[PDB]
């Protein structure tokens, strides 16, 4: 069975996720509206920028993160922002229509929409396959929330300094994950290995996005559609 | 009477203004919506950012501008952007309600709205007085359009290099302005002097804004509400 510290970590992650994710997608009415040339780029850039804010709120509540140096926190966030977002967006992905359905016709992001944000099929093909692969896993909230924090606490990212300390933190979320699945998830003899496989997929999706984002950011007519936060997090400083 | 070159300059400015100003305020539906803490800041920053794009389209069509060096064009635009915008916004100012009325309840920008964009009364007091002062002048389109280009072509701005060449260009819009008023504006024996007085007012409003904008830009929680264009044009690079 699980230990006190191991369930404290679980209670904390679940609570943080609930404080930083909105199943109603209310604040989407505050974004630059969608348009369907790169019509969808302003709305989706607003979506990402918003998500980065929520990821930072999540990250600040992961046990041990707040005690890293500010550089290591930035290093981890710059490298893992897009992955955590790809991770949390699974909560809105629908298998019926292969789209993210954040509400009604306007906020129903299908494949043609994502291409009108300046991204090609080379990103879209494995991203969707990753989503339905993730959706089929039927994760519990604890596993989902643990996967996000495990991904964020990866020490194999550029710019990290204290990679033994954050490997320590990562090495222990994985313990909580393995213990949770064994005690509390029936029929999950294979689930942990499959979740760790998704982390590898995300590394690949990360590189494909940042490659296409480099192309957007180098074209001022498109980079001006971005937000300061986006440009800061995804920039090269 | 007016000369061929002097009316060519008039035809060009009037046409450029018509190509870069929309009396329907259609594209306002594309901005981040208004909210009424600095609630109004995202929508108004989107408004300014849009206006900067239209000012650049105007400026490119002023005779002689396109032949300045790219540095001088940038120098002129960075220093005079807010003034030209304060100038063009008079076309939407209403004396009945002392507000800019770009359409219906949402895009009716009154005094309380501008304060919810992080600007104090020290800017708002003389800006409104400038607007009704400008409104009472009852300018013809030619004078309005000429005032904008005269203001933009001021050589008394930081960063300009070829200040004799642009003083030459400015010194001749003023000629077209004086000639237009004499030949074609009845009862305007005093109008030119009064218009040149407005240029001085704008210098003062310019400094009051950029002083309050420096305060916004130094607070990252507010500067992140700005657009890249805004931050580029109003930045210190």
């Amino acid at each position: 069975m699980l230990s006190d510290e191991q369930m404290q970590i679980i209670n904390s992650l679940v609570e943080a996720h609930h404080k930083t994710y909105d199943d109603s997608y209310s604040d989407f009415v505050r974004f630059r509206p969608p348009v369907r040339r790169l019509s969808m780029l302003p709305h989706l850039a607003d979506l990402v920028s918003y998500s980065i804010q929520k990821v930072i709120g999540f990250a600040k509540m992961i046990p041990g993160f707040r005690d890293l140096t500010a550089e290591d926190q930035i290093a981890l966030l710059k490298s893992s922002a897009i992955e955590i977002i790809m991770l949390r967006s699974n909560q809105s992905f629908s298998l019926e229509d292969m789209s993210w359905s954040c509400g009604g016709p306007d906020f129903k992001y299908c494949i043609n929409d994502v291409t009108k944000a300046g991204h090609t099929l080379e990103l879209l093909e494995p991203l969707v396959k990753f989503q339905v692969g993730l959706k089929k896993l039927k994760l519990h909230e604890e596993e989902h929330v643990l996967l996000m924090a495990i991904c964020l606490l990866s020490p194999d990212r550029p710019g990290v300094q204290d990679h033994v300390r954050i490997e320590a933190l990562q090495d222990r979320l994985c313990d909580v994950l393995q213990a949770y699945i064994r005690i509390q998830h029936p029929g999950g003899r294979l689930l942990y290995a499959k979740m760790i496989q998704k982390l590898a997929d995300l590394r690949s999706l990360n590189e494909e996005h940042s490659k296409q984002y480099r192309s957007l950011s180098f074209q001022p007519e498109h980079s001006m559609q971005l937000t300061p936060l986006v440009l800061e997090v995804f920039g090269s400083e | 009477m007016l000369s061929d070159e002097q009316m060519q300059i008039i035809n060009s400015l009037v046409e450029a203004h018509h190509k870069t100003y929309d009396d329907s305020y259609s594209d306002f539906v594309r901005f981040r919506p208004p909210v009424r803490r600095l609630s109004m800041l995202p929508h108004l920053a989107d408004l300014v950012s849009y206006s900067i794009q239209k000012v650049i389209g105007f400026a490119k069509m002023i005779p002689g501008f396109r032949d300045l060096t790219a540095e001088d064009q940038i120098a002129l635009l960075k220093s005079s952007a807010i003034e030209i915008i304060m100038l063009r916004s008079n076309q939407s100012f209403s004396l009945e309600d002392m507000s800019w009325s770009c359409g219906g309840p949402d895009f009716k920008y009154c005094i309380n709205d501008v304060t919810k964009a992080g600007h104090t009364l020290e800017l708002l007091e003389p800006l409104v007085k400038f607007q009704v002062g400008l409104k009472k002048l009852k300018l013809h389109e030619e004078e309005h359009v000429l005032l904008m280009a005269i203001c933009l072509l001021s050589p008394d701005r930081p960063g300009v290099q070829d200040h004799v060449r642009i003083e030459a260009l400015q010194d001749r819009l003023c000629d077209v302005l004086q000639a237009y008023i004499r030949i074609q504006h009845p009862g305007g024996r005093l109008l030119y002097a009064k218009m040149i007085q407005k240029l001085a007012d704008l210098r003062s409003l310019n400094e009051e804004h950029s002083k309050q904008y420096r305060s916004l830009s130094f607070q990252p929680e507010h500067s992140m509400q700005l657009t890249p264009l805004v931050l580029e044009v109003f930045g210190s690079e």
């Binding site: 804010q53 930072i56 930035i74 | 990252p220």
Partner: peptide, 9 residues
């Protein structure tokens, strides 16, 4: 990363 900084309090 000053925005990030302020967001990281």
């Amino acid at each position: 990363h000053k925005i990030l900084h302020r967001l990281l309090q």
